[PDB]
């Protein structure tokens, strides 16, 4: 759970998953992004469970 | 289940503490910085390994 | 007073040694600040490149929407989107390269500072 989008580390394990939850009280900024080792890019993807 | 510890860099004279499950598992004191050998001590990867 | 002369000179060894140690402390600390600045620059580059990505989502989306209702399709209709996607790729390549130049400048500055500290320590030692 990382508050802001920029809080994500520049590099991470390939399968890592992080949720933004920007506001923590509104559903406007809730989405998940997973890292991509080979491309070195955080890709928005479907959430866990 | 898991977490990460992003290391932006190292600054001389500071202390690094990692608190997990109520325990200060990791404690490192970067030297003052007078010796050139402290370059490894302040290096991001060397500090992450330590 | 030979002892007085020895004490005075011993103070010079103390002056030069602590002066040299401080030269390394100041040079080593400045380098860390430059490294942190480079990291912050990388973060800023990432943020602006993400903004470029988000604009791309809407841009290529509109190209697909209009080229999708046109009723023409073909090779020219795909060349329209291909050229557009390329512009975004090149623009991001420039953000990723402006960062490389800045990091190179920081690298050169750090080497210059280290060499200056080295020369100053040689001067101190030479007495």
From Swiss-Prot, chain A:
Top-rank taxon, per record: Viruses
Localisation per UniProt entry: Virion
Record's subunit section: Interacts with head-to-tail connector protein gp8, the tail component gp11, and the fiber protein gp17.
Summary of the function given for this chain in its UniProt record: Structural component of the short non-contractile tail. The tail complex is involved in viral genome delivery. Forms the end of the tail, including the canonical tube, the nozzle, and the small extensions below the fibers. Once the tail tubular structure is formed, the interface between gp11 and gp12 generates the proper environment to interact with the six gp17 trimers.
UniProt-recorded name of the protein: Tail tubular protein gp12
Species annotation: Escherichia phage T7
Coverage span on the entire protein: 250 to 298 of 794
From Swiss-Prot, chain C:
Superkingdom of this protein's organism: Viruses
Any one GO CC term of the record: virion component
Keyword set, alphabetical order: Host cell outer membrane, Host membrane, Membrane, Viral genome ejection through host cell envelope, Viral penetration into host cytoplasm, Viral short tail ejection system, Virion, Virus entry into host cell
Main location, first listed in the record: virion
Keyword Membrane listed: yes
Signal peptide annotation: none
Keyword Nucleotide-binding among UniProt keywords: no
Cell compartments where the protein resides: Virion; Host cell outer membrane
Example GO biological process: symbiont genome ejection through host cell envelope, short tail mechanism
Subunit structure: Interacts with the portal protein. Interacts with gp15.
Family the entry assigns: Belongs to the T7virus internal virion protein gp14 family.
Function: Component of the cylindrical core that assembles on the inner surface of the capsid during capsid formation and plays a role in viral DNA ejection into the host cell. The inner core is composed of stacked rings of gp14, gp15 and gp16 proteins. Following binding to the host cell surface, the internal core is disassembled and gp14 is ejected along with gp15 and gp16 into the infected cell. May form a simple channel spanning the outer membrane.
Protein name: Internal virion protein gp14
Organism: Escherichia phage T7 (Bacteriophage T7)
Source organism phylogeny: Viruses, Duplodnaviria, Heunggongvirae, Uroviricota, Caudoviricetes
